[PDB]
Design a protein around this ligand. Structure first.
Ligand SMILES: Nc1ncnc2c1ncn2[C@@H]1O[C@H](COP(=O)(O)OP(=O)(O)NP(=O)(O)O)[C@@H](O)[C@H]1O
Ligand SMILES: Nc1ncnc2c1ncn2[C@@H]1O[C@H](COP(=O)(O)OP(=O)(O)NP(=O)(O)O)[C@@H](O)[C@H]1O
Ligand SMILES: O=C(Cc1ccc(C2CC2)cc1)N1CCN(c2ccc(Cl)nn2)CC1
Ligand SMILES: O=C(Cc1ccc(C2CC2)cc1)N1CCN(c2ccc(Cl)nn2)CC1
Ligand SMILES: [Mg+2]
Ligand SMILES: [Mg+2]
Lengths: 352, 352
């Protein structure tokens, strides 16, 4: 049986697959052809069907897992296409997490003799995150931050050490947002969540601009000016609000300039995509900051796929967390950010 | 000189006017005709021009202020129309607060010999709130809550006593949101704010539905079903998320169902207005709850004009605060909610 871990989210399915590379001569003979076919299918293709993608750059090579050497692969596809995944599977012990492990439990059992083991979405996140950081990203740091995020001429990606990783505030930006406080390897809690997450960005963007993909939404946002839609402190005060240390450039009301018909008529779709991204990102950062202060944690790590190929939101989070916390909180990021649940599910395999 | 207090916000101008009713015989003779004309204009009309409105139901009658008996009147108009207000004024000591006291300072001084005194937007809010509650709403309570907000068959407006009003968390929902912690009559701080406020509701609603007024937006929202646009916990899990006590009906991703083209094509403008209102209101409630927990305050009062003629958002806030705090926080509301800054400005008059 192949070694998979699967995180079925509200939007994306994430799959971690361990490919053994220490296959001896006798082991190759005893391989059933269907097992050889899936290993060849998975390792010889980087696109699967029309919507599956292997993130080749994330591969962990020559990892020792469960006493065997192999490569750890990272694969994703839309949850909407899980039926075709299951159908392909019908013509193994599956550790699965995420809400879809429950929602589609009966669907997975249409695969004969398949054993589905459901694991909690946030236990898997914690164990997966701690594992990937512990084994490193092929010798490089898994964790990074943006040094000197206040000054754009100096702001640059730099590695960050998590060898004593506690305590830690984990902000999981998926369809929505879950916020976790991790005090030890076995002591963590979901502090709260917010429903203004990646699905809000993509859903509002699609309604406002007609964009057809996450990447197109980000491409529109990179070209826009959010201040065409947003009402700033200086639009209300004429400048800074000195008394409470609010700079004139801070957003006082997101989309607040859209109450005027003449401004709605001159705003571009790119401006609206950027205002949607800025609105969602700032709100996540603000909620993360309040939770950090309440939990007495100064290390805030952001994960989930809202931030994949999304440097605008990462830099916005880095700069805002540092600015609004007066330098007391650090925004941290991880290279394998969308995949920790799928990895943690895979790690549950010896328990079955 | 007439006794005004004025709060010039990003969206609305709020004006409090004290009409003396103990005008003696000699005092009437010494009245300059222009002063008589403005008192008659203000008291004989409830609509001023095309956009000014006197909120007659809020009037405080037979109030003793600055040693005189009179009626306190509450008037509002869009900040966009302040030029016509100033122009009417050109063809007095003005205590003014809000951002527009700074932004339009030079405009007010086009009125000959007028003395403009700027006062801080949040000092005025605190002093105005404490004053109105102290004098009562013509003998009725100024403060109210929704009793038994968990059960709709029982949920009803009930008076609430603020005679020892400290400590208090004040949530000012205007264009944006300011959150204040009030520890004493002279000890208060702005804890934080959020830019997802009333202007976001109105701006997004206008973009999404084409509505032309705040009231039309609320009317559309009353007819919609936000779950057509929002992705719920049960859409992701198939039911409750038991492990972390998340009910199936909770919103996991606001507008998160709008990532699917077929759902964007079947959603109604009413559904989108309701999803906008629900999204903004829940986020305000969530931010208010985190601040309350951090400040160790269990009384949360919501003010600002986002909640005027907006019972949907008030009940949503009442129910959500009680549910998510497991009954530890009470949502409180005030009858004069949009006007406390304007009242507090008026109260600054003896200092000049
Ligand atoms: N190719 C993509 N397709 C869709 N969304 C994408 C894509 N790439 C990035 N995203 C973003 O990533 C978000 C989903 O992130 P993800 O961490 O996979 O959440 P999820 O697990 O599917 N949902 P959840 O059930 O709340 O945990 C989307 O809302 C988008 O903002
Ligand atoms: N007639 C109205 N016109 C416009 N907005 C209205 C109206 N009635 C209610 N509102 C709502 O009330 C909000 C403005 O509330 P208000 O408390 O007056 O803020 P403000 O003081 O003008 N802005 P701010 O500078 O942030 O304090 C708007 O964003 C709407 O959501
Ligand atoms: O966590 C969430 C939302 C959510 C996010 C992600 C997921 C992922 C796991 C699938 C689920 C749910 N919420 C709890 C707190 N909320 C409020 C609302 C009002 C008040 Cl006053 N307070 N809190 C908002 C809802
Ligand atoms: O108060 C505000 C917004 C605001 C609201 C109302 C007004 C009224 C007075 C005119 C002004 C400003 N903000 C401070 C905290 N913000 C963040 C952002 C990111 C992070 Cl990480 N943290 N905090 C958001 C902005
Ligand atoms: Mg997820
Ligand atoms: Mg205001």
């Amino acid at each position: 049986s192949p070694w998979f871990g699967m995180d079925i989210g509200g939007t994306l399915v994430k799959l971690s697959y361990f490919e053994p590379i220490d296959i001896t001569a006798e082991e190759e003979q005893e391989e059933v052809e269907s097992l050889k076919s899936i290993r060849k299918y998975l390792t010889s293709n980087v696109a699967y069907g029309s919507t599956g993608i292997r993130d080749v750059h994330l591969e962990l090579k020559d990892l020792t897992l469960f006493g065997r050497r192999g490569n750890l692969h990272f694969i994703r596809f839309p949850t909407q296409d899980l039926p075709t995944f299951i159908q392909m599977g019908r013509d193994t012990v599956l550790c699965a997490t995420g809400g879809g492990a429950y929602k589609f439990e009966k669907d997975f059992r249409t695969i004969g003799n398949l054993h589905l083991h459901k694991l909690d979405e946030l236990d898997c996140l914690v164990k997966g995150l701690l594992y990937i950081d512990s084994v490193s990203f092929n010798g490089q740091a898994e964790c990074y931050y943006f040094a000197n995020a206040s000054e754009p001429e100096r702001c640059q990606k730099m590695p960050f050490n998590l060898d004593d990783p506690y305590p830690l505030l984990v902000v999981n930006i998926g369809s929505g947002v879950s916020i976790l406080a991790v005090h030890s390897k076995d002591n963590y809690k979901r502090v709260t969540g917010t429903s203004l997450g990646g699905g809000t960005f993509l859903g509002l963007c699609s309604l406002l601009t007609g964009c057809e993909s996450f990447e197109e939404a980000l491409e529109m946002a990179s070209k826009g000016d959010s201040t065409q839609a947003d009402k700033l402190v200086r639009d209300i005060y004429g400048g800074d609000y000195e008394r409470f240390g609010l700079p004139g450039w801070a957003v006082a009301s997101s989309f607040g300039n859209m109450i005027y018909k003449e401004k709605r008529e001159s705003v571009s779709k790119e401006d609206l995509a950027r205002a949607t991204l800025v609105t969602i990102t700032n709100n996540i950062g603000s909620v993360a900051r309040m939770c950090a202060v309440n939990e007495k944690i100064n290390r805030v790590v952001f994960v989930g796929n809202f931030l994949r190929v999304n440097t605008l939101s990462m830099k916005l989070l880095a700069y805002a967390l540092d600015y609004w916390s007066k330098g007391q909180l650090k925004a941290l990021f991880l290279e394998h950010e969308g995949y920790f649940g799928a990895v943690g599910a895979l790690l549950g395999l010896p328990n079955f």
